[PDB]
Structure formats: structure tokens, C-alpha cells
Enzyme design. Structure first.
Site, PDB file in Angstrom:
ATOM      1  N   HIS B 137     -43.318  80.836  64.173  1.00 19.04           N
ATOM      2  CA  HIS B 137     -44.339  79.885  64.232  1.00 19.04           C
ATOM      3  C   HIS B 137     -45.638  80.392  64.442  1.00 19.04           C
ATOM      4  O   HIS B 137     -46.663  79.864  64.055  1.00 19.04           O
ATOM      5  CB  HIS B 137     -44.041  79.138  65.941  1.00 19.04           C
ATOM      6  CG  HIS B 137     -42.779  78.315  65.661  1.00 19.04           C
ATOM      7  ND1 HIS B 137     -41.475  78.593  65.494  1.00 19.04           N
ATOM      8  CD2 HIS B 137     -42.822  76.919  65.805  1.00 19.04           C
ATOM      9  CE1 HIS B 137     -40.800  77.362  65.709  1.00 19.04           C
ATOM     10  NE2 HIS B 137     -41.461  76.517  65.586  1.00 19.04           N
ATOM     11  N   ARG B 170     -45.569  79.428  71.613  1.00 20.10           N
ATOM     12  CA  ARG B 170     -44.227  79.943  71.675  1.00 20.10           C
ATOM     13  C   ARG B 170     -44.038  80.476  73.237  1.00 20.10           C
ATOM     14  O   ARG B 170     -42.812  80.693  73.650  1.00 20.10           O
ATOM     15  CB  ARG B 170     -43.853  80.589  70.669  1.00 20.10           C
ATOM     16  CG  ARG B 170     -44.206  80.145  69.034  1.00 20.10           C
ATOM     17  CD  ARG B 170     -43.279  78.804  69.136  1.00 20.10           C
ATOM     18  NE  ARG B 170     -41.840  79.059  68.935  1.00 20.10           N
ATOM     19  CZ  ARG B 170     -41.060  78.348  69.277  1.00 20.10           C
ATOM     20  NH1 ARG B 170     -41.271  76.855  69.800  1.00 20.10           N
ATOM     21  NH2 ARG B 170     -39.730  78.591  69.127  1.00 20.10           N
ATOM     22  N   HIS B 176     -40.746  82.823  72.620  1.00 22.66           N
ATOM     23  CA  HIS B 176     -40.876  84.192  72.092  1.00 22.66           C
ATOM     24  C   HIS B 176     -41.753  84.852  73.089  1.00 22.66           C
ATOM     25  O   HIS B 176     -42.648  84.365  74.002  1.00 22.66           O
ATOM     26  CB  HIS B 176     -41.355  84.203  70.752  1.00 22.66           C
ATOM     27  CG  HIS B 176     -40.489  85.369  69.952  1.00 22.66           C
ATOM     28  ND1 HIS B 176     -40.077  86.645  70.539  1.00 22.66           N
ATOM     29  CD2 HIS B 176     -40.104  85.225  68.508  1.00 22.66           C
ATOM     30  CE1 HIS B 176     -39.711  87.157  69.341  1.00 22.66           C
ATOM     31  NE2 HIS B 176     -39.520  86.474  68.550  1.00 22.66           N
ATOM     32  N   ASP B 180     -44.633  89.231  70.154  1.00 21.76           N
ATOM     33  CA  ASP B 180     -44.326  88.816  68.859  1.00 21.76           C
ATOM     34  C   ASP B 180     -45.075  87.653  68.377  1.00 21.76           C
ATOM     35  O   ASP B 180     -45.351  87.546  67.310  1.00 21.76           O
ATOM     36  CB  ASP B 180     -42.820  88.273  68.961  1.00 21.76           C
ATOM     37  CG  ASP B 180     -41.903  89.358  69.511  1.00 21.76           C
ATOM     38  OD1 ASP B 180     -41.576  90.166  68.587  1.00 21.76           O
ATOM     39  OD2 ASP B 180     -41.685  89.733  70.825  1.00 21.76           O
TER      40      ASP B 180
END
Lengths: 237, 237
Positions: B137, B170, B176, B180
């Protein structure tokens, strides 16, 4: 001593909108910067530190030599005049030149904070009074990596890796914090996006692609010790 | 489900070469990931979390809707077909479907580590078994931000900011880690560099520039609640 940038000031990416605040005091983000500093200073005296010293050289042909081995051919006025010009002008767009003090955080550099030395003692009188946010070397390195990778897609990985290592050299040199190198890459990529809206940049980009194609097809190898730079980089990609 | 990507597999940027290792156990880098998780979970129940829930939608027209306000006109098949297609195909190139587990780190997601929920309960059965590295994403968000900024240079800062916020969603969603998401932007910028070497991408890009300009000149407003998105994001002029 600076070439004209491609971008007008109003077309430069806006640091405040794109970047977060620097690591706060007492934060784990700041601890990550100190951890990265300590890991980097373990390389003091190594060939990687020596490569970080030449990576600090922004006076041309400094950057041209630095990226020649990753490109696979020598970047020079004689062989790649438009690419040479493009690197000079994009240094102004992407580098510390745009990082004014107004509407910017003042960053005390690691070697000043810890009253220690850098890998380029000669550049310290300038850097001590400099609190640029984020890292301009990092931004220019990543911008150069992304543009050069488009110029020579067959060496895209080598060029983008080299542009990332160029920013990491600032941590190894103890010249800037990891977070400012990371934030530099946000600005570097953003500047490349703006450059692709600029017809002057695009014309030099198109000419540079033909120059690199001609040099590689004619078998012109870099005039740098690419073996020694590879060792200093560690590779093992 | 997935549109054809522009890039052949051999032309995808190499994660292993471009990214560092994920934060190690007991490291300040991991501490920064936990700190960002805690700051993000303070926004549980907020409008910013709600916006992160729609930012999670990769099924089109999800992404087209998400970037319409930042673009200043609605991204749709009817009004901007080539831009719509371009976003679909770049989703495949940049958005994690290329992140094979082979030659990649396995990442346990925050909500799994801490046995807690995300902002998208419906997506958890898939995400629980998914350890993709880095954030797809985030990579797609930054890639879309950088390409759209070139398409509509007058809204470059809005679009690049939105693409970074897309990745930050995210973390806010607890899907996440920060590291990341950060690494996602390296891959996104790299993918954009590769895309500019791809003639099919370049053809759709040129048409998208004409589509967006025509739509903005005809006064076609975004068909999204830009006021509500502005409040949720905390946008500053």
C-alpha cells in the site's frame, strides 16, 4: 558556484508538507538515530569511510565520478555533456541549495552534538554552522539514482543502490543523522517527479539517454577504480 | 482481480538490493516501530482512522476515489480513462503483488504480534497469513503520488502529500509497521523510475495529462467529500 536549477522556486517540493518533524527528544526515533550513528562510526578507518569522504564532494566532477562505475561509463563533459549538465542543475534542485532556514527545522548535526570529527575535516567549518533539513546529499543522491536508472535501465539496480549508498555516506561520515538521510530520499524522489514536469530537464534527459547509449555501445568504460569502489561498498547485493 | 502490470518481471526493482533488513529484536529501530504503533492507536475511533479504512481499499475504483480530491478532479473511467487504467496497472507493478516470499523477509504484522484489531476487520483473514515486505500500500501510494504530481504539476504537493498519507494509513490501521511503510516509499520511487522507461506507461501517462487538464479546465470537481478528507488528514495550507 552553483549551476542554475531547472525548477523555479514555486515548483520546488514543499519540505513542510512532505516531511514529518525530526525525531523528538527522548523518543525511540531519536534513539534509532543514535543507534545508526554508533553502527556507522564502527566503520571509522575503513575503506567504506574513505568512500564516504569522496561521496561528500559536491563540486563537479565529484558527483560525475561518483556515479560513473554504477552507470558503466564515464560521466564527463566530453562524453556525456547533457548528462553532466543535468547532474549539475539537478544538484541545485535537489540538494541543500533549496533548504533555506525559513520554514525549516534547525538540525544540529551528529558530530557537533557529540563534539567529534567527520570523515571530511575540511568541510566541517561549513557544516558546523549548517543546520540543513533534511540531508541534501541524500536527496541529490537518490534523485541522481532515480534519473540515471531511467537513463540506463539495464543498470537500474546498480544506480539506485549507489544513490542510496550516497545518502548513507552522510551517516558514515558522521555528517548527518539517519532520519535526515531518510527524509532526504523523500525530497529526492519528489524533486524527480517535479523535474519530469519541466521541459528543460526532459530535453537534457532525452539527450543524456542517447549519450549513455553511444558511450556504452562504443565500449567506453569508467575512468574510475570500480573494483575499489565495489569493495568499499561491500556489494553482496 | 489484478490488471496487467507495465513492467516485465526482470524490470522490477530488486527489494533485496534496495532495502535494509527489518528492525532487529531489541533494537532502537524496533522501538521506533512500537512507538509509532502506539501513537497511531491513539487515533482509534477518529476520522483519521476512518480515512485509513478507505485508504486500505485496493479494489478499484478505491484508489481512484482516494486520490481524486488531491488531484482536483474525479478519477473515473468516464472522465479520465487512461489515468484510471494507469493507476490499475501501476497497482500491479508497485502494490505488493510482486513481493514474493522467496528472497524476502517474512514480516509479522503489528495487529498479529499484539493480538489486536485493525481498522478493516474484513481484511484481517488475509492479512493474518500475509507477511509481505515492505508495505505494498505504501509503495503504491507513493508511486501514485509521484506520477500524479507529474500529471498535474500545479497540485504536486497535494498529491505527493496524499501518497505519503496513503502509506501512513497502514500504520494508523495497525496493518503494517512504520519501517515497512518507509521502505515502501523506496520501492515506490524505484518503480516510478522503471516505469518512465516503459513505452506503454509513457503512452498512458501522456493521455492522462490531457485527460486531467481537460477535466480541470471544464470545472469537473472531485466527486468525493474533500472537506471531510481535509479534516481527517489535518491538512495545512
Amino acid at each position: 558556484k552553483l549551476a542554475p536549477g531547472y525548477l523555479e522556486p514555486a515548483d520546488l517540493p514543499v519540505r513542510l508538507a512532505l516531511l514529518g518533524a525530526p525525531p523528538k527528544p527522548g523518543s525511540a526515533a531519536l534513539a534509532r538515530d543514535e543507534e545508526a550513528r554508533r553502527a556507522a562510526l564502527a566503520l571509522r578507518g575503513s575503506s567504506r569511510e574513505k568512500l564516504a569522504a569522496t561521496d561528500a564532494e559536491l563540486s563537479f566532477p565529484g558527483p560525475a565520478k561518483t556515479f560513473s562505475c554504477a552507470l558503466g561509463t564515464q560521466i564527463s563533459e566530453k562524453s556525456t555533456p547533457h548528462l553532466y549538465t543535468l547532474m549539475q542543475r539537478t544538484l541545485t534542485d535537489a540538494g541543500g541549495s533549496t533548504y533555506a532556514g525559513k520554514n525549516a527545522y534547525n538540525r544540529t548535526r551528529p558530530f557537533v552534538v557529540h563534539d567529534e570529527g567527520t570523515c571530511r575535516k575540511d568541510m566541517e567549518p561549513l557544516l558546523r554552522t549548517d543546520g540543513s533539513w533534511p540531508s541534501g546529499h541524500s536527496a541529490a543522491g537518490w534523485a541522481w539514482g532515480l534519473v540515471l536508472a531511467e537513463i540506463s535501465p539495464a543498470r537500474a539496480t546498480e544506480l539506485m543502490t549507489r544513490g542510496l549508498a550516497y545518502g548513507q555516506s552522510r551517516v558514515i561520515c558522521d555528517a548527518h543523522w539517519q532520519s535526515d538521510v531518510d527524509a532526504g530520499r523523500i525530497m529526492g524522489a519528489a524533486t524527480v517527479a517535479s523535474l519530469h514536469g519541466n521541459p528543460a530537464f526532459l530535453a537534457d534527459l532525452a539527450a543524456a539517454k542517447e549519450e549513455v547509449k553511444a558511450a556504452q555501445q562504443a565500449g567506453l568504460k569508467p575512468a574510475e577504480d570500480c573494483a575499489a569502489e565495489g569493495v568499499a561498498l561491500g556489494l553482496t547485493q
